[PDB]
Design a protein around this ligand. Structure first.
Ligand SMILES: Nc1ncnc2c1ncn2[C@@H]1O[C@H](COP(=O)(O)OP(=O)(O)OP(O)(O)=S)[C@@H](O)[C@H]1O
Ligand SMILES: Nc1ncnc2c1ncn2[C@@H]1O[C@H](COP(=O)(O)OP(=O)(O)OP(O)(O)=S)[C@@H](O)[C@H]1O
Ligand code: SF4
Ligand code: SF4
Lengths: 324, 322, 507, 331, 289
């Protein structure tokens, strides 16, 4: 595989009482794959992405059995050799663009740095490729809007400047953290069609973290569903939402406006996520799950491998019928 | 009686300079339009990224003064100061910020951020403000352990909910909701939207609901307004816009919405041609460079909202059809 | 041949008539000008300057000066002399200072501070040109110090040929700012608060200087002056800080030259204030003080301890009186006789500025405080910035005040008269408010009387009556120290506190 | 027209405060010129009335500012030369030293205080900050004599004190500007420029030591606030070398308090260099103003405070303009 | 279960701990303060008693030194150690009052200037430019003429020459903050001007002010020493570290201890207030929580 993550965990707080923001996560990405990551707000999706790049800071602690990229296991090699591997071959679109762009430099400076590091052209070539990228991400007037500061951008423009700046890195793996949040449905579709033609032509890997289930169903090859720090389902994108294997993935799809009347109350899981102090023994979905057996209230369900190659972290992997 | 909010021809334009001694150019961020907002009602605002929606929200919230137009709340001018009124008018109009991390003070705990609205505007003792803060946090799926945290020790969808909690806190008459649910999963989105609709029914709270996710607007709205290049292009009731969209920007926009069922999926219009610039917006209709319904007036004259059965549309081809 | 001297601060300007500071006289009087009569280097003794010869009338009211032939003036980029020195140059030099109708009187602010402070306006009646080479001073009363007053820096002779050339040229300030004199050196440059460059005058009437050029490197820190002297950036320096004297005595690259200085430091008792109006209390507060400890501690061995106001090396010194030598026991007994065994509080004013006569008045006041403490007198050390110290002291607000004097002209009148006379009381310089008739009736006749033995006798009596009455602690006379490089030949230390270079050689 | 703003109230404030302040201090220039000697009451009244000091303070102030509005700063009571012709040679020597001190203090204090933030808690952090606070908490007299005694006297590496070698002089026939580093570079003979910079080393070190600790600590504190921000995470993730994340990304956001302390410290370097000027025998404005204040040379205190006040207003106006170059959000 | 709620003080101390230097700093500051307040129970001798037989007696470990005077004696024969410990009284007091009052007024004026902007800012900035221009000796002589000779009139002269640095550093921070969305969001909640600057903006401005207050102790002693070359300072027999250093600078190449031990007392008290400043930055920094 290109990226191979095994038993990844990330802890926040003192060692005595760690908050398991990421909790024995295990997944892999091949060259040319698109992997979707889906799940509740707070489930570990950003922190997992930051951990696979070393971007977690002092209050957090990262650990794994394996955390390897392009033949190098990133924990054993020197931090110098990790840095000049991961920065040259990996890129990330961070979740909030307003805080992720440097306040004091123009858009063009911040893009043309990425072209200089990763492609190496002269200053006139760097401007022309920055205009080409700002045209690809559909910025309204790129030759004037190179010379603009991030606080003068709208939220969906600063987001597209960092999509352009990630594509400018010409990476081998791209992690995209809700890359369509501040985008209208038309420019959202342009960005996904751009990221997928890039994956098809340059054979790069893509990791789409998104709350837009319909978009990741169209775009992904494999989907990882995540809850309370753990993977809960994993399998082919065209399969996962057609007939789901986990009660979480089922109750997530039930919440869509597609299944509700013109002004009526939407469906949801009737409870709140486990924190530092109220974390279940056994399965993390215990207090919310409609199908919770006393085995669930006792035993941590394994990431059970099913006959159709897909995986579910449930004692009772759901049938095609949508029942235990 | 006057509407709860009434905008009339609101404009906002921003200075831009290429360097400290360079000529000061003008960005046409909102060349905007009127609307009426009544009590107990949702007005959704939809349109292109960078078309002026958050700029409008800042004018309605009184964060910025407009470069033109008028803004009345209940028949009271918001664009002139009155010290006997402003104490009440300030708590009665509130905002949920887009990209709210920069809107949370990094040196404050979430309890202090959520109690500050109450501490300024109410008689509530320390235990009663903590009770309100935890009660509002519970109603958006946060926790008593989160009250003690600084805003950087959260995920983006938890920062969305801290900004929602702060906005809903006061019993306001209008909330300007700027992309309020976009960093939320579909189950937490459902919890938040159910709270907003419960407050609209119980309190009479109205919304200006700025969203790029059309599947939510198709559910929460009562009126919908479509924007392009700082101006409004179509306005109507939610049925009128989603069942019979007449402006070809609205048709291209509603056509590109993602839908989970494979069958339901359709080809987007694949709009092609140069984008219009906010620094030099084109003469006549803003959309003309990319529009499929090209006609003579479009490159020459500015279209304006015409009635067509209560569905305000600003398009010469719809006028020619009628 | 070049000599560099490290000066204590900077000159105020180059005409010495307008200025009161020794650092100005070193730059502006000694190198640039002569005087009618002048001091023999290292002494009070008056010898012929620009006057070869002089005569005093039998009544002492006329002094006649016969001027030296061949004396010729400096040259400058705006002036060359046609004349030698006339009686007209001497007449204008003193008429400028005395006469309100003279062209130059108001020029450069007219602050002739020594001429007026010495009372020469009253004393000099006229300045007559007898002939082209004879000058007469007619005086309203006789004064024996007058000849030594004409040996001071303000008595420098200025060119009338240059003065009226600058006046017809419409720029009279050039007489003061661009100096012409008769002296051994002429001014080439002054870089403001940095350095002064002089050239030896090739036409000088005395012995021409053995150094072709002289440079004052203005160096305001006394410790940095010794660093410049150690490194041979500088061959002579003034005022070594007392702490380095020990090290300088041991330094094989220099001669540390010494001279008993004509100056005095004293603590002045205000006789108008109730505890100090009794001679017994003033004597007791004197017996109570260990002067030898103040010499070892404050002066670091640089002073000699003082028993009466006149320095021991000056003429008229009474060595035949014995001091109130340190005796706490004696001190306590004499306050009991005054009725003050219960003690009293007293103010002990100390100047914050350094002086030639007092190198640290604060740590001296801290020693007098501890000395008086052991005797039951509660001394409170008071200090003010120098302008406020001078103001309130002259206004009589003090009980005791630190003071001193540096001899202008080497005559004992310059001490007794200016510090302890009724006249001095009037002008504010009697910081003791002490008018005593028996002192006056000695010091006055000794000003007028021409018989040097009668002056010596009356000043010897003035020291007896002043010692019995004790208007001050008299603490010390500073030894003037001159660190000089061993390569410098012919240097001699001046007791009046000036510096001289015309007799100096480098080899 | 001029860019300073509030020009009339500024002038009336500087001048009326400085005038009322020097005329509240007890004593008079005549009283201090006389020293331990007396001046008789009748001559003291005469000389005060001749200088103009017997008039009430409102009349004296109007006469002074009337003169300054018509272009006249007055005559120095010490030197008998116009206050301007006294000011200029000293302002030039003070700029030349204050610029060399700031070029040293910034050229050392920017690299060192960046490294102390990049290497937090290291032997380097504690040594660099310790060394800086050592130089900041020695009196300039002791620190200056330690450098003179070590480097000039013991090691023989530098000249002791002064602006240029005492027996080497420039010709006044060349059009000298009055800055020795310029004057000796253009019109000096062989070695005369090397001598003029050799006399600058120790003064610039001693005067620049008190800025260097402010620049080192302020840049380090500002860096530690910046290095944890989400855009520095982006610069690390974009594949940039650590030198670019530090120098381009972090330092640009740290510079705003740093250019604030550089501006404040330039204000001190014009007005207040007196201890360094005393040790290093420098012909600057600090010795001149304090000697004037001690002598009650009222024209020099009034005119020197006004001409130091204007240069401070202009430096503070320039760094306020420079904030918008550092942080574009402020424009 | 959930931990015990932490009071702000508790949190402040907890996060101050983590910096080993910051608690070495506070331990010294409490040690010199204990030495200062109780000097009359701890000092070997009464200061202003002179051991006249022992002028410039060196430290107890030097040749010609004696165990009677551990740090030797000054040029009038007083014990350097007894003078340092009583000298901690006035030096800590004027150092703390100068830093406290200049920080208070500098925060108030610099918040008002940066928050309100415009004419207010221009007036305030013009005022502090005039205060930077006035020599410290001129302010000292003026205050003595208004209020008489007192230790407090040097503290006021030192306060007004320090005040510009706090005003301008405070304004420079407030100009970054007043533009940020959390100031806007607090305005929309209804915060008035005082709440905006003192409760919401000020917590974000402290990083330069902690640097300036940590340096400002050194100046409040060394510029008191520079005034101490003239008639402004403590009443002469009473010790203060800046005055007792200024009095003896001519004993540098000879008698090294009289300069060196007041030098160490200031240097350590400066070095170790700067260590407390790093701990105060870290305890207020949310990214370290
Ligand atoms: N520094 C921190 N200290 C404590 N908790 C933190 C901290 N940073 C993040 N969290 C927790 O980390 C968990 C995972 O956060 P993220 O990975 O950012 O969430 P996420 O799965 O990406 O959710 P979204 O998609 O960004 S809304 C959340 O439950 C937070 O409560
Ligand atoms: N302070 C500003 N200075 C200059 N230009 C600005 C500023 N604020 C916004 N803009 C521009 O104003 C236009 C409108 O931006 P927005 O108001 O954010 O539009 P928007 O529809 O809300 O875009 P979204 O929803 O945030 S993606 C864009 O061209 C911006 O770049
Ligand atoms: S293991 Fe039990 S609690 Fe967990 S998801 Fe399956 S049924 Fe629910
Ligand atoms: S006016 Fe013309 S260009 Fe504009 S939207 Fe209508 S048809 Fe298209």
């Amino acid at each position: 595989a290109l990226l191979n993550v095994d038993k990844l965990s990330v802890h926040f707080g003192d060692e005595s009482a760690p908050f398991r923001a990421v909790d024995r996560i295990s997944y892999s990405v091949k060259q040319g794959e698109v992997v979707g990551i889906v799940g509740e707000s707070g489930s570990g999706k950003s922190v997992s992405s930051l951990a696979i790049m070393g971007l977690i800071d002092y209050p957090g602690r990262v650990m794994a059995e394996k955390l390897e990229f392009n033949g190098q296991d990133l924990q054993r090699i020197s931090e110098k050799e990790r840095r000049n591997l991961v920065g040259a071959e990996v890129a990330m679109i961070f979740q909030d663009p307003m805080t992720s762009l440097n306040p004091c430099y123009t858009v063009g400076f911040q893009i043309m740095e990425a072209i200089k590091v990763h492609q190496g052209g002269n200053k006139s070539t760097r401007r022309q490729r920055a205009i080409d990228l700002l045209n690809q991400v559909g910025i309204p007037d790129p030759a004037s809007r190179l010379d603009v500061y991030p606080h003068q951008l709208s939220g969906g423009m600063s987001q597209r400047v960092m999509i352009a700046m990630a594509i400018a890195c010409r990476p081998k793996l791209l992690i995209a953290d809700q890359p369509t949040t501040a985008l209208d449905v038309t420019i959202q579709a342009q960005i996904i069609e751009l990221l997928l033609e890039l994956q098809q032509k340059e054979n790069m890997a893509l990791v789409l973290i998104t709350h837009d289930l319909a978009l990741v169903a169209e775009a992904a090859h494999k989907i990882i569903v995540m809850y309370a720090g753990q993977v809960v389902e994993t399998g082919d994108a065209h399969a996962i939402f057609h007939a789901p294997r986990h009660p979480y993935t089922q109750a997530l799809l039930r919440a869509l406006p597609e299944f509700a009347q013109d002004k009526e109350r939407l469906a949801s899981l009737p409870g709140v996520v486990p924190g530092k102090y109220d974390r279940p023994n056994g399965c993390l979905l215990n207090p919310r799950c409609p199908y919770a057996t006393d085995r669930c209230r006792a035993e941590e369900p394994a990431l059970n491998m099913l006959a159709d190659g897909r995986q579910s972290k449930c004692h009772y992997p759901l049938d095609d019928a949508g029942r235990p | 009686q006057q509407p709860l909010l009434q905008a009339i021809d609101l404009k906002k334009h921003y200075p831009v300079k290429k360097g400290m001694f360079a000529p000061e150019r003008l960005v046409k961020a909102l060349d905007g339009v009127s609307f009426n907002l009544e009590r107990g009602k949702t007005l959704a605002v939809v349109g292109e990224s960078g078309c002026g929606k958050s700029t409008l929200g800042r004018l309605l919230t009184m964060i910025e003064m407009p470069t033109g137009g008028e803004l009345y709340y209940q028949g009271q001018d918001l664009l002139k100061h009155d010290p006997q009124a402003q104490k009440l008018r300030r708590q009665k109009i509130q905002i949920v910020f887009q990209n709210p991390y920069g809107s949370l003070n990094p040196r404050k705990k979430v309890g202090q951020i959520l109690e500050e609205p109450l501490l300024i505007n109410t008689s509530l003792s320390k235990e009663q403000r903590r009770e309100k803060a935890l009660s509002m946090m519970a109603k958006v799926g946060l926790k008593t352990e989160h009250y003690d945290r600084y805003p950087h020790m959260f995920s983006g969808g938890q920062r969305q909910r801290i900004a929602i909690a702060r906005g809903l806190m006061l019993d306001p008459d209008v909330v300007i909701a700027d992309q309020p649910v976009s960093a939320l999963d579909v189950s937490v989105r459902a919890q938040v939207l159910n709270l907003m609709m419960d407050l609209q029914q119980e309190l009479g709270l109205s919304y200006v609901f700025i969203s790029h996710d059309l599947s939510v607007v198709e559910h929460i709205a009562d009126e919908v307004m479509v924007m392009y290049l700082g101006r409004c292009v179509e306005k109507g009731t939610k049925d009128q816009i989603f069942n019979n969209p007449r402006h070809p920007y609205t048709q291209a926009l509603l056509s590109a919405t993602p839908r989970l069922n494979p069958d339901d999926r359709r080809e987007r219009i694949k709009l092609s041609g140069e984008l219009p610039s906010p620094l030099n917006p084109p003469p006549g209709c803003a959309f003309n460079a990319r529009c499929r319904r090209r006609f003579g007036p479009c490159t020459q004259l500015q279209p304006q909202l015409k009635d067509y059965g209560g569905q305000l549309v600003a398009c010469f081809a719809v006028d020619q059809d009628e | 041949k070049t000599l560099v001297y490290c000066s204590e601060g900077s000159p105020e300007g180059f005409n010495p008539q307008l200025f009161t500071s020794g650092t100005t006289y070193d730059a502006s009087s000694v190198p640039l000008y002569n005087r009618l009569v002048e001091f023999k280097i290292g002494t009070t003794e008056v010898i012929p300057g620009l006057a070869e010869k002089w005569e005093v009338s039998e009544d002492g009211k006329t002094y006649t000066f016969h001027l030296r032939k061949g004396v010729k003036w400096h040259d400058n980029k705006e002036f060359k002399p046609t004349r030698e020195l006339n009686a007209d140059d001497v007449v204008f030099s003193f008429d400028r200072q005395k006469n309100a109708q003279n062209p130059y009187h108001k020029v450069s602010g007219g602050s002739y501070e020594y001429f007026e402070g010495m009372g020469l306006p009253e004393l000099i009646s006229e300045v007559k040109k007898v002939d082209d080479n004879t000058v007469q001073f007619v005086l309203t009363r006789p004064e024996a110090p007058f000849l030594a007053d004409l040996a001071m820096d303000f008595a420098s002779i200025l060119s009338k040929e240059y003065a009226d050339a600058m006046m017809k040229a419409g720029t009279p300030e050039k007489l003061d700012l661009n100096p012409i004199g008769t002296g051994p050196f002429q001014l080439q440059q002054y870089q403001k608060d940095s350095r002064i460059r002089y050239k030896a005058f090739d036409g000088y009437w005395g012995t021409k200087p053995q150094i072709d050029t002289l440079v004052f490197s203005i160096t305001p820190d006394a410790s940095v002056r010794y660093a410049k002297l150690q490194k041979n950036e500088c061959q002579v320096m003034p005022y070594p800080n007392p702490a380095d004297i020990a090290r300088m005595k041991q330094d094989k690259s220099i001669n540390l030259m010494e001279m008993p200085g004509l100056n005095v430091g004293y603590l002045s008792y205000n006789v108008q204030k109730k505890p100090l109006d009794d001679v017994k209390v003033r004597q007791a507060l004197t017996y109570a003080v260990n002067k030898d400890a103040i010499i070892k501690a404050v002066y670091q061995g640089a002073g000699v301890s003082a028993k009466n106001l006149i320095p021991p090396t000056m003429w008229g010194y009474n060595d035949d009186v014995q001091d109130y030598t340190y005796d706490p026991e004696k001190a306590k007994a004499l306050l009991k006789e005054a009725g003050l065994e219960k003690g009293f509080s007293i103010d002990l004013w100390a100047m914050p500025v350094q002086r030639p006569y007092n190198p640290n008045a604060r740590r001296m006041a801290e020693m007098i405080q501890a000395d008086w403490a052991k005797v039951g007198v509660q001394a409170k050390i008071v200090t003010y910035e120098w302008g406020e110290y001078l103001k309130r002291a002259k206004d009589g607000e003090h009980q005791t005040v630190m003071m001193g004097w540096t001899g202008d002209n080497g005559d004992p009148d310059n001490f007794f008269a200016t510090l302890f006379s009724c006249a001095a009381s009037e002008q504010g310089s009697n910081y003791s408010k002490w008018c005593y008739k028996p002192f006056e009736d000695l010091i006055q006749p000794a000003r007028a009387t021409d018989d040097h033995n009668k002056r010596v006798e009356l000043y010897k009596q003035a020291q007896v009556v002043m010692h019995d009455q004790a208007p001050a602690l008299i603490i010390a006379h500073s030894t003037v120290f001159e660190p000089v490089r061993k390569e410098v030949k012919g240097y001699v230390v001046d007791p009046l506190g000036k510096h001289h270079f015309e007799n100096v050689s480098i080899e | 027209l001029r860019r300073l703003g509030l020009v009339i109230p500024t002038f009336i404030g500087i001048t009326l405060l400085t005038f009322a302040f020097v005329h509240m201090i007890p004593g008079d220039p005549v009283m201090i010129m006389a020293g331990e000697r007396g001046i008789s009451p009748e001559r003291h009244a005469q000389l005060l009335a001749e200088l103009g000091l017997d008039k009430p303070m409102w009349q004296q102030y109007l006469h002074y500012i009337w003169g300054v509005m018509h272009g006249d700063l007055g005559i120095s009571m010490k030197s008998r030369i116009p206050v301007w012709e006294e000011f200029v040679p000293r302002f030039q020597a003070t700029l030349e030293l204050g610029v060399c001190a700031m070029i040293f203090a910034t050229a050392v204090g920017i690299p060192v205080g960046v490294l102390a933030a990049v290497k937090r808690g290291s032997i380097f952090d504690h040594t660099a900050v310790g060394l800086a606070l050592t130089g900041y908490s020695m009196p300039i007299f002791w620190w200056g004599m330690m450098l003179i005694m070590l480097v000039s006297v013991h090691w023989n590496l530098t000249p002791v004190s002064g602006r240029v070698s005492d027996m080497v002089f420039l010709d006044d026939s060349n059009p000298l500007t009055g800055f020795m580093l310029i004057d000796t570079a253009i019109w000096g003979e062989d070695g005369n420029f090397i001598d003029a910079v050799a006399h600058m080393i120790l003064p610039a070190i001693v005067l620049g030591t008190i800025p260097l600790a402010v620049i080192v600590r302020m840049t380090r504190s500002s860096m530690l606030e910046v290095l944890g921000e989400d855009y520095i995470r982006t610069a690390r993730a974009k594949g940039l070398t650590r030198m670019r994340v530090i120098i381009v990304h972090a330092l640009r956001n740290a510079m705003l308090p740093v250019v604030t302390v550089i501006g404040l410290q330039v204000g001190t370097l014009l007005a207040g260099a007196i201890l360094t000027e005393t040790i290093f025998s420098w012909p600057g404005l600090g010795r001149w103003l304090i000697d004037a204040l001690q002598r009650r040379d009222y024209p020099v205190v009034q005119g020197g405070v006004l001409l130091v006040a204007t240069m401070i207003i202009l430096v503070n106006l320039l760094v306020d303009l420079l904030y918008g170059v550092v942080n574009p959000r402020i424009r | 279960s959930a931990p015990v709620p932490m009071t702000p003080l508790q949190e402040f101390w907890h996060y101050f701990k983590r910096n080993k230097g910051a608690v070495v700093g506070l331990v010294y500051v409490v040690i010199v303060l204990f030495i200062a307040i109780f000097a009359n129970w701890i000092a070997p001798y009464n200061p202003a008693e002179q051991f006249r037989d022992a002028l410039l007696a060196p430290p107890a470990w030097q040749e010609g030194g004696s165990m009677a005077h551990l740090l030797g004696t000054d040029d009038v024969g007083r014990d350097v150690l007894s003078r340092l410990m009583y000298g901690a009284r006035l030096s800590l007091l004027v150092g703390c009052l100068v830093v406290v009052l200049s920080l208070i007024m500098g925060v108030i004026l610099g918040l008002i200037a940066g928050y309100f902007g415009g004419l207010v800012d221009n007036i305030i900035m013009r005022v502090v430019d005039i205060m930077l221009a006035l020599p410290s000796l001129l302010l000292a002589l003026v205050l003595v003429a208004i209020f008489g000779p007192s230790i407090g009139n040097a503290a006021l002269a030192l306060t007004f020459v320090a005040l510009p640095h706090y005003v301008r550093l405070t304004r420079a921070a407030v100009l970054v903050e007043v533009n940020r969305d959390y100031v806007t969001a607090s305005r929309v909640a209804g915060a008035g001007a005082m709440r905006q600057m003192f409760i919401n903006i000020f917590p974000n401005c402290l990083a330069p002010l902690i640097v300036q207050a940590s340096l400002g102790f050194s100046n409040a002693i060394l510029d008191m020493a520079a005034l101490g070359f003239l008639g402004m300072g403590a009443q002469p027999p009473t010790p203060e570290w800046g005055t007792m250093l200024s009095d003896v600078l001519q004993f540098a190449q000879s008698a090294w201890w009289v300069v060196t031990f007041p030098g160490l007392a200031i240097l350590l008290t400066v070095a170790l207030f700067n260590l407390m400043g790093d701990g105060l930055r870290d305890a207020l920094d949310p990214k370290l929580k």
